[PDB]
Amino acid sequence: NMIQGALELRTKTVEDIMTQLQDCFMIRSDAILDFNTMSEIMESGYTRIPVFEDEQSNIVDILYVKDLAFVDPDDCTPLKTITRFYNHPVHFVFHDTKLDAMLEEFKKGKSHLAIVQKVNNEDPFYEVLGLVTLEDVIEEIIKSEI
Amino acid sequence: NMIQGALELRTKTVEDIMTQLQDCFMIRSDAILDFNTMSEIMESGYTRIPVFEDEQSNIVDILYVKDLAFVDPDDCTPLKTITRFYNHPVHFVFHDTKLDAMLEEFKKGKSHLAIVQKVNNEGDPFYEVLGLVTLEDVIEEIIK
């Protein structure tokens, strides 16, 4: 039993865990932080929000919502200021990657949020299927062993 | 790797993971939101701050720092107004609770900060507040 849960964990990929891109809450890099955008970001509940340029599949920066604390919606400062400030390293991963290697990347200090990419032959280009995070990994651990 | 994470997940008690109370960053519930207060909350780096009344051991509320988005410090807004307005839940947990079980409690939708309680027989017995443990604390203790 412990064996089956263990290797069933070890056999999953990020594709099988990751929240799908269409169910993720993202934000356009051009966006300005006004009461509507701000309120939306809060109401979303996500602590880390992807910031993408143009097409949804190209993710430039990452927004930590605690950083919106002092932003006043009356100043209407664009999120572009914030993301162009940070330039957090974006974390990319192959869709076939096993969870143990993922846990290695997280142990080495990489961003706890990671973006799932697959080579699309349909020249081949890299498409973004969605997002997986360390919390999803550990969730799979404690779920699958029981 | 996965095995190491699961095993360390089921051995460690939240007491081992926890941040002691004396070293916590808390805020009194009567505090007001002027520049020193907001600047302190910002430089603390905590995303969820415990809110207490009288002694530090009595933790009445929780402040999600992101709420503070809609406050301005020139208003001198009482933290009591915010705490009464959102009414966020406080989470208590037994000092013997294993880490994975704690992940189950947080996963149920409870606040991602949890207060660790011990039973104290040493002088009528009472429940004792040792500190707090956060979901982030748990995950960090898995990757180390």
Numbering used by the authors:
A (entry chain C): 360 to 481, 485 to 508
B (entry chain B): 360 to 482, 485 to 505
From the paper:
The Cyclin and CBS domain divalent metal cation transport mediators (CNNMs) are the most recently identified proteins involved in magnesium cation (Mg2+) transport across the cell membranes. The four known members (CNNM1 to CNNM4) encoded in the human genome are integral membrane proteins with strong homology to CorC, a bacterial magnesium/cobalt efflux protein. Structurally, the CNNMs are complex multidomain proteins that consist of four independent domains connected by linkers of different length. The intracellular region is directly attached by a long α-helix (H0) and comprises two distinct domains, a Bateman module and a cyclic nucleotide monophosphate binding-like domain (cNMP domain).
The CNNM4BAT domain is formed by two consecutive CBS motifs, CBS1 (residues 371–435) and CBS2 (436–505), that present a αβαββα fold and contact each other via their three-stranded β sheets, resulting in an overall pseudo-C2 symmetric structure. The N-terminal connecting helix H0 packs against helices H3 and H4 of CBS2. As in other CBS domain containing proteins, CNNM4BAT features two major symmetry-related clefts, S1 and S2, formed between their stacked β-sheets (central right panel). Of note, an acidic cluster (E497, D498, and E501) at the N-terminus of α-helix H4 in S2 replaces the positively charged residues found in S1 (R407, K425, H471, T406). As observed in other CBS-domain containing proteins, including CNNM2 and CNNM3, CNNM4BAT self-associates into a disk shaped head-to-head dimer commonly referred to as “CBS module” (upper and central right panels) where both CBS1 and CBS2 pack against their equivalent in the complementary subunit. In CNNM4, this disk is semi-twisted and both CBS1 motifs are slightly separated. This particular CBS module represents an intermediate state between the apo form of CNNM2, where the separation between complementary CBS1 motifs is more pronounced (“twisted” conformation), and its MgATP bound holo form, where the disk appears planar (“flat” conformation). In the semi-twisted conformation, the CNNM4BAT dimer interface is stabilized by an extensive network of hydrophobic interactions. Upon dimerization, the H0 helices from complementary CNNM4BAT subunits lie crossed, as observed in the twisted conformation of CNNM2BAT, and participate in the CBS2 dimer interface via their residues N360, M361, I362, A365, and L368.
